[PDB]
Design a binder for this molecule. Structure first.
Ligand SMILES: [Ca+2]
Ligand SMILES: [K+]
Length: 385
């Protein structure tokens, strides 16, 4: 189900009534009604303040035996109202009918009545006011706009190519700005023979940490304080092997470290994985992760101690900045930290590493919806010693 928010109607007035009061339209009762005789008469609903509205619902007196003509108008003052919908009721139901229009800011909503099939009465039994289907929109045009330092990363695409100079790059099919112009999207489709990427290799659209001037790949150590914060949603998984890696700390394979600490989603299972189980056992974050749920995550390394913070409440960045973030730690038994280990040659990765390919998807390879996807609203990293 798409999400549909319902605004409370705090008051209602009208140009006219015959003793069937305007309040009768919001009492949840099908046997009470508003009535006013004459084309042009209207009822006006008040939401208390201005809200984004894109749907009005009405149920009509004799809604299943006659049709009613009307128009809807919206705005912040009752003399500043602009028309957004006009038409006729269906004549086939006594329940709510949905009338939807361009989302518009309004405090007041007015239905104007033009009589009905039989006579000039306007009569309404129920009315509701809605936004039908959540981060504030932005002004991003290209993915580099969402990066605070566009020099500090390089991207690796699913076609096997790389870009070390992301400042100014255009939106592409693997890395682009979402609709609301507030996030970057890392899309990793599953296809056979995609550029130089082997069919048996897994598929990434993801950032690798660089020096802040972009001169080269950066390597750091577990000594000192090192942080990655990401606000993101995992929005899609492949069809057969619905497995995907988002945020990561990486060291050398040669040292038995490799992908030391990563966030992984398998189905609804969201967990942290430590060199794929070779350092320590997977640690579960959530068993019921729903695709498209915006979360925040921090990996924090302090002289070898690895801490995991997770939140779906929107407040993790604010809390970490205010110093009150302990509430969001993912604890492991009776330890505040999920792992203690020292290594060097370490760097961060952010984005989408989809753990599937053409061999695992087989016949569903090339399918339109056979891709992994990660939407990143915000992120930062810090280093200290
Ligand atoms: Ca009623
Ligand atoms: K470039």
């Amino acid at each position: 189900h798409k999400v549909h928010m319902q605004y409370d109607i705090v008051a209602v007035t009208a140009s006219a009534h015959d003793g069937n009061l305007p309040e009768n339209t919001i009492d949840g009762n099908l046997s009470t009604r508003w009535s006013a005789n004459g084309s042009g008469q209207y009822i006006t609903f008040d939401l208390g303040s201005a809200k984004t509205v894109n749907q009005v619902k009405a149920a009509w007196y004799n809604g299943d035996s006659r049709t009613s003509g009307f128009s809807i108008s919206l705005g912040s003052d009752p003399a500043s109202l602009t028309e957004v919908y006009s038409g006729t009721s269906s004549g086939q139901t006594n329940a709510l009918e949905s009338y939807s229009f361009t989302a518009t800011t309004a405090r007041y909503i007015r239905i104007t009545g033009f009589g009905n099939s039989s006579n000039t009465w306007n009569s309404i039994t129920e009315v509701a006011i809605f936004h039908a289907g959540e981060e504030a929109p932005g002004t991003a045009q290209i993915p580099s706009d969402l990066m605070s330092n566009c020099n500090q990363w390089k991207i690796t695409y699913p076609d096997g190519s790389e870009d070390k100079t992301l400042c100014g790059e255009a939106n592409n099919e693997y890395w682009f700005v979402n609709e609301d112009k507030n996030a970057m999207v890392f899309r990793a489709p599953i296809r056979s023979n995609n550029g130089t990427t082997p069919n048996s290799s897994y598929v990434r659209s993801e950032l690798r940490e660089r020096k802040e001037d972009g001169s080269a790949d950066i390597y750091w150590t577990t000594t000192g304080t090192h942080v990655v914060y990401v606000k993101q949603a995992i929005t899609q998984l492949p069809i057969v092997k619905d497995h995907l890696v988002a945020t990561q700390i990486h060291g050398d394979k040669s040292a038995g470290i490799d992908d030391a600490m990563v966030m992984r989603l398998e189905g609804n299972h969201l967990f942290a994985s430590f060199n794929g189980g070779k350092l320590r056992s997977d640690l579960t974050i959530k068993t019921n992760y729903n695709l498209g749920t915006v979360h925040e995550v921090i990996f924090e390394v302090i002289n070898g101690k690895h801490y995991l913070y997770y939140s779906e409440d929107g407040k993790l960045a604010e809390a970490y900045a205010n110093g009150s973030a302990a509430a969001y730690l993912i604890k492991d038994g009776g330890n505040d930290y999920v792992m203690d280990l020292n290594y060097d040659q370490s760097y961060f990765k952010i984005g989408n590493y989809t753990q599937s390919n053409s061999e695992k998807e087989g016949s569903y390879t090339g399918d339109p919806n056979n891709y992994g996807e990660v939407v990143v609203y915000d992120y930062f990293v810090s280093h200290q010693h």
